[PDB]
Design a protein around this ligand. Sequence first.
Ligand SMILES: *[C@@H]1O[C@H](CO)[C@@H](O)[C@H](O)[C@H]1NC(C)=O
Ligand SMILES: *[C@@H]1O[C@H](CO)[C@@H](O)[C@H](O)[C@H]1NC(C)=O
Lengths: 43, 50
Amino acid sequence: GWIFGTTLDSKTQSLLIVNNATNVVIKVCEFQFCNDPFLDVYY
Amino acid sequence: YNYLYRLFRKSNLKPFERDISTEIYQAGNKPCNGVAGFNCYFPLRSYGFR
Ligand SMILES: *[C@@H]1O[C@H](CO)[C@@H](O)[C@H](O)[C@H]1NC(C)=O
Ligand SMILES: *[C@@H]1O[C@H](CO)[C@@H](O)[C@H](O)[C@H]1NC(C)=O
């Protein structure tokens, strides 16, 4: 997936595209994730 | 005073664009650092609607 935004923090809406094995979710939310993002392989 | 409008930092909005950020607007050289003082004020203003 990808993240799009100006500052990618809690002060600005950011667009997130996540393509896991079943579907694609696109969320436009202002939630701040950590820099150098990661996705867990196993639960 | 429920309805509010916006005053940006000489940045016109794009067509069909909406902002929600409520950071302190700066008009001078010094940073506001979250304090609304001289050349620093809250950009969201309320209508009268009387
Ligand atoms: C993929 O993401 C969707 C939405 O987040 C979720 O419903 C689904 O269970 C996920 N599938 C896997 C295999 O993680
Ligand atoms: C989008 O962000 C850039 C970088 O801060 C800015 O120069 C531009 O004016 C912004 N567009 C707006 C507020 O419509």
